[PDB]
């Protein structure tokens, strides 16, 4: 195929879908593109640079709810942004694993900056707004991971029923439920001000 | 060294600390123990069986707050149990990655069963109690992961300050903060009953 940022990424995405993050090796990428390793090396220097680019690309191509709508509430944003995040993280095999460890990329600077400011101008201190943003991120990541990494791998009464409930759907209900509890818990903090809550 | 469940696990734990979950190969384990691969194979059948055992052992050896104290509140348990969980997950390199994908092991059946019943007899339905337990688990996992996997790998004003705050300590504050918001959010649900909250 052609060898430019976009073509290379597409092949990388398709390859991830087939072999998972572990099967994803520059060697396999070369074959997929129908080229020799030295040709690939000229474009993609290594596995981490390749994965970093993927983490970025996955979000820019599927994470539709990144910036808040006109006059939207901080609660609705956190909910919508979290859902979008989870959605994008699921689009690809090991998607959540690819994202793991990454920090805002330059292209994202704009988007993340805006998220932080939006939270402050709604009553959050940089600290608290950051923490709300973080908790949502950490909660979404772990849920998706435990879901994906689970599928890719004598019981007592309550536990038994628990296990059936956890298979009813692909962890979606439990997530949305936890998401609400998280957002609400943030409310009780914002409105609590300096009072003992 | 000796080759029995405990000696093999110890070597596996020490090895994980040195090479990470990826460097952890049955081949490297054999050398560490000072034995030949076929000797190891007689004991440890494969990487997954080895990792599963580790996930179990890490918790049984460091997760001290697994069952609730006499007459303890569901909020204090969720908080203490979550802290212990995070603590154990940090004790070893890639600890959170080892745990990923695992389900309660037979030895744990007792412990998990008890956690579920304790939540129900405090007003939670199996469903809701499960979800509270899950959200805590998913939140703790993701925080630890993003922390560990981060270390093992032109900025705008707000984002810049945000990044400094996220390095102040090893993600502990942000976690405890999110933990409280999560627990509180669960309260608002329990006491809300059938009323529109
Ligand atoms: C502890 N260590 C990871 C260092 C550290 O905390 N730095 C960080 C400091 C600040 C951030 C960080 C990290 O890692 C992110 O990774 C964010 C996202 O991925 C994003 O989803 C993020 O990048 C985007 C996005 N591009 O749209 C989001 O939608 C945010 N929501 C909450 C899902 C989220 C914003 C985070 C900002
Ligand atoms: C979606 N998929 C993973 C399937 C599924 O959800 N099954 C599951 C169904 C039910 C559970 C599950 C999974 O995976 C656990 O993994 C739990 C723990 O690891 C534990 O930390 C857990 O094993 C222990 C423990 N042994 O002490 C804990 O302390 C619990 N707290 C909340 C940290 C937690 C209980 C979970 C029960
Ligand atoms: Mg991230
Ligand atoms: Mg688990």
Swiss-Prot record, chains A, B:
UniProt keyword annotations, A-Z: Antibiotic resistance, DNA-binding, Magnesium, Metal-binding, Plasmid, Repressor, Transcription, Transcription regulation
Binding of tetracycline: at which residues?
63, 81
Q: What induces it?
A: By the [Mg-tetracycline]+ complex.
* Residues within the DNA-binding region(s): 25-44
- The residue ranges of the HTH tetR-type domain are 2-62
GO BP, sorted A to Z: negative regulation of DNA-templated transcription; response to antibiotic
Nucleus as UniProt keyword: no
| GO molecular function annotation | DNA-binding transcription factor activity; metal ion binding; transcription cis-regulatory region binding
Q: Which residues bind Mg(2+)?
A: 99
SUPFAM superfamilies in UniProt: Homeodomain-like, Tetracyclin repressor-like, C-terminal domain
Gene3D superfamilies per the UniProt record, alphabetical = Homeodomain-like (1.10.10.60), Tetracycline Repressor, domain 2 (1.10.357.10)
NCBIfam families the UniProt entry points to:
PRK13756.1 (NF010319)
Function according to Swiss-Prot or TrEMBL: TetR is the repressor of the tetracycline resistance element; its N-terminal region forms a helix-turn-helix structure and binds DNA. Binding of tetracycline to TetR reduces the repressor affinity for the tetracycline resistance gene (tetA) promoter operator sites.
Cite the record's note on assembly. Answer: Homodimer.
- Name of the protein: Tetracycline repressor protein class D
Q: Tell me the organism's taxonomic lineage.
A: Bacteria, Pseudomonadati, Pseudomonadota, Gammaproteobacteria, Enterobacterales
């Amino acid at each position: 195929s052609r060898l430019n940022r976009e073509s290379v990424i597409d092949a990388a995405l398709e390859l991830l879908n087939e072999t998972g993050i572990d099967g994803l090796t520059t060697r396999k990428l070369a074959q997929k593109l129908g080229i020799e390793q030295p040709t690939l090396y000229w474009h993609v220097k290594n596995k981490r640079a390749l994965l970093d680019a993927l983490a970025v690309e996955i979000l820019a191509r599927h994470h539709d709810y990144s910036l808040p709508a006109a006059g939207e509430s901080w609660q609705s944003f956190l909910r919508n942004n979290a859902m979008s995040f989870r959605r994008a993280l699921l689009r690809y095999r090991d998607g959540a694993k690819v994202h793991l460890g990454t920090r805002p990329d330059e292209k994202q600077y704009d988007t993340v900056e805006t998220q932080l400011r939006f939270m402050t101008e709604n009553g959050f201190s940089l600290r608290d707004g950051l923490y709300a943003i973080s908790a949502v991120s950490h909660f979404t990541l772990g849920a998706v991971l435990e879901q994906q990494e689970h599928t890719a791998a004598n019981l007592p009464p309550l536990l038994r029923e628990a296990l059936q409930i956890m298979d009813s759907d692909d962890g979606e209900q439990a997530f949305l439920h936890g998401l609400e509890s998280l957002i609400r818990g943030f409310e009780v903090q914002l409105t609590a001000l300096l009072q003992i809550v």
